UniProtKB/Swiss-Prot annotation:
S-adenosyl-L-methionine binds at E35, E60, D87, D110. It comes from Escherichia coli (strain K12). The active site is at D110. The keyword S-adenosyl-L-methionine applies. This is tRNA (guanine-N(7)-)-methyltransferase. Disulfide bonds: none annotated. Residues 116-121 are annotated as: Interaction with RNA.
Length: 208
């Protein structure tokens, strides 16, 4: 169909040198959740559909994914979803106000299997710090991966940052929350583990 063309003018948000005003954007004062790299937006649409009392922003640079998400959001009659097609880090720096977000989601970011590409992995200290600055206190950074070396790297990064508190009761990974759906990479309750690792850290006041 012609989803980008049809639905971008209503739900799309253009990149700007200026901070977003969430009340003006969403027409109300409500909690805001950002999904970074939403793919086809299946998780984001399901999330927004279940929480009409909350607002949702998505970022995805893969424009066919953006189109798929718009088509689905339109079909579900969502009024509480906006999407961007711009580098997420630039959007975080330029357009997301500090302390503004209830939740940030990062599901299956490029795992960059090869050791020579390890630095291409988006979860690193400066990125996670930037995300933390955009969370309100008590807000959560939730990431997921189906690649264990990435999961271990994510845990190392997150554990090193003052102001992030691990919500894992075993100091590593958390049960999949309702806020993320089961995927095809996933064998829930499998004897060798689910095959997907969830990490959730709450923003707390700095200790040191």
């Amino acid at each position: 169909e012609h989803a980008l063309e049809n639905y971008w003018p209503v739900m799309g948000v253009e990149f700007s040198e200026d901070m977003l005003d969430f009340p003006a954007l969403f027409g109300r004062e409500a909690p805001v959740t950002l999904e970074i790299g939403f793919g086809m937006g299946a998780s984001l649409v399901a999330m927004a559909k279940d929480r009409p009392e909350q607002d949702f922003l998505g970022i995805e640079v893969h424009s066919p994914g953006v189109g798929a998400c718009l088509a689905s959001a339109h079909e579900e009659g969502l009024s509480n979803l906006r999407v961007m097609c711009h580098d997420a880090v630039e959007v975080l720096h330029k357009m997301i106000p500090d302390n503004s977000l209830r939740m940030v989601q990062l599901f299956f970011p490029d795992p960059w299997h090869k050791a020579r590409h390890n630095k291409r992995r988006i979860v690193q200290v400066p990125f996670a710090e930037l995300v933390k600055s955009k969370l309100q206190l008590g807000g959560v950074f939730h990431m997921a991966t189906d690649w264990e070396p990435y999961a271990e790297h994510m845990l190392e990064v997150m554990s090193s940052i003052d102001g992030y508190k691990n919500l894992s009761e075993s100091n590593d990974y958390v049960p999949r929350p309702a806020s993320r759906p089961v995927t095809k990479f996933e064998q829930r309750g499998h004897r060798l583990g689910h095959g997907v690792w969830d990490l959730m850290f709450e923003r707390v006041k700095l200790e040191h």
